[PDB]
């Protein structure tokens, strides 16, 4: 069957360029020609140990669009899981006897990988494990960039905001570094700069990257403007204000932007992108969000259905 058949989808790093291409290819296909009965008699577990509505609704919607059945929860004190000392291991050993696939979201970093060792034959798709991995988020980002730019190589990518803790941009930076000729522009306050280990990686692959203090500094060159969330709880309230400065995007900043540029954002944007931007042709965060359905549908189709789509 297809290369991802019955494979656990835990980390983006475990995904080869080939894999990414196949997932993105499938995504485009299902988008063009939906297959509502593909996974008809399948039952999928949507296990959100840590709540995350949007990601959960996107994931489950994908399951339904393929015809699969869904059961699950949101352990945010809504269930009766692991009260005293009941392990994640035992939970998986149980649930893995009920369903055909487990989609899980957990607060601890290696949850999905652990699940993998107790789910015998049942595939586990990581919907997010603490500060570590979030495979499908990266896939939907790459898909959006590819669809709006027509390729994933030789692009000018700007990433703004909290580049230090936003593991969303770490995963996306590494994903794009598996393609050639990309140039990166990193805009972030000194206290939240891209980590050195990421720059080390870019250097060793000879990829070009530069630091900048403002978006306007490179607005003219950028193909993709990736806006990130800057959590208040991070810095000091006064610290934030002093830096939020322009790591905030406003319609006015797009005066000299490329006709093809798209502004992306992991989503909760309240404090980073002004609504006046929503009207411009560059705003693509809602479309980006909409693409989560195809990337996640493609992933489920690939691991649960032997042959390729069509």
């Amino acid at each position: 069957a297809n290369p991802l058949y019955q494979k656990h989808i835990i980390s983006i790093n475990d995904l080869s360029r080939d894999d990414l291409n196949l997932v993105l290819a499938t995504a485009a296909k299902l988008k063009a020609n939906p297959q509502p009965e593909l996974l008809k008699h399948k039952v999928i577990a949507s296990c959100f140990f840590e709540a995350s509505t949007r990601t959960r609704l996107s994931f489950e919607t994908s399951m339904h669009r393929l015809g699969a059945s869904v059961v699950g929860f949101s352990d945010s004190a809504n269930t009766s899981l692991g009260k005293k000392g009941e392990t994640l291991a035992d939970t998986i050993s149980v649930i893995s006897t009920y369903v055909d696939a487990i989609v899980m979201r957990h607060p601890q970093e290696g949850a999905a990988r652990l699940a993998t060792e107790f789910s015998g034959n049942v595939p586990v798709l990581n919907a997010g494990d603490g500060s570590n991995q979030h495979p499908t988020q990266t896939l939907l980002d790459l898909f959006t960039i590819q669809e709006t730019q027509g390729r994933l190589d030789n692009l000018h990518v700007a990433m703004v905001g909290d580049l230090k803790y936003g593991r969303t941009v770490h995963s996306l930076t590494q994903a794009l570094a598996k393609f050639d000729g990309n140039r990166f522009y990193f805009i972030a306050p000194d206290a939240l700069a891209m980590p050195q280990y990421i720059l080390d990686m870019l250097d060793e692959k000879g990829i070009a990257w530069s630091l900048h203090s403002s978006i306007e500094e490179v607005m003219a060159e950028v193909d993709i403007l990736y806006m990130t969330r800057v959590q208040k709880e991070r810095l000091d309230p006064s610290e934030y204000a002093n830096v939020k400065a322009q790591f905030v995007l406003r319609a006015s900043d797009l005066h000299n932007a490329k006709a093809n540029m798209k502004v992306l954002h992991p989503l909760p944007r309240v404090d980073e992108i002004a609504t006046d931007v929503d009207k411009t042709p560059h705003a693509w965060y809602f479309q980006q969000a909409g693409n989560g359905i195809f990337a996640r549908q493609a992933l489920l189709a690939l691991v649960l259905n032997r042959d390729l789509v069509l």
Binding site: S11, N13, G85, T87, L88, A89, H106, P107, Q108, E109, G110, A111, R113, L114, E117, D129, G130, S131, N132, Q133, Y197
Partner: protein
């Protein structure tokens, strides 16, 4: 019968013996690797004379051999320690602990939010040698630290 003595202090026979273990690292290996869970005989000596100027530990455990992906596991603790197979010197290559690609079951992830802590799984870290340092990447949380971090906490 061919064995020949009653030695409770320093002997030999079909058994593995680890050599030149730094002081306070011998007992560590006994614990970390549960080398006393054996039924086979064991003779250890600690804080004894070294290369004419120091102190060292010594571990002799009869009727049992070590492998390549095991002796290596001593690399992070007893680097310059030699391991003479002793069925009677049936040792081949210059058996010295090299750095393994993976170190399991002994290390503890410094990351408090790592799933490995409250679960029935074995620790597992990938090894990468650094200049003045050693990087260990947790199989689970995928966070990377220096052995100096992983050995303190």
């Amino acid at each position: 019968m061919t064995h020949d003595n009653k030695l409770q202090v320093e002997a030999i026979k079909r058994g593995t013996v680890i050599d030149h273990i730094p002081a306070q690292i011998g007992f560590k290996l006994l614990s970390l690797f549960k080398l006393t869970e054996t039924d086979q005989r064991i003779t250890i000596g600690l804080n004894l004379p070294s290369g004419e100027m120091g102190r060292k530990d010594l571990i002799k455990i009869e009727n049992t051999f070590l492998s390549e992906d095991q002796v290596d596991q001593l690399a992070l603790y007893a680097p310059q320690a030699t391991v003479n197979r002793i069925d009677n010197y049936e040792v081949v290559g210059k058996s010295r602990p090299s750095l393994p690609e993976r170190i399991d079951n002994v290390l503890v992830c410094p990351n408090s939010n790592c799933i490995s802590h409250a679960e029935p799984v074995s620790s597992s870290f990938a090894v990468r040698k650094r200049a003045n340092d050693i990087a260990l990447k947790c199989k689970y949380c995928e966070k990377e630290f220096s052995h100096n971090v992983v050995l303190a906490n």
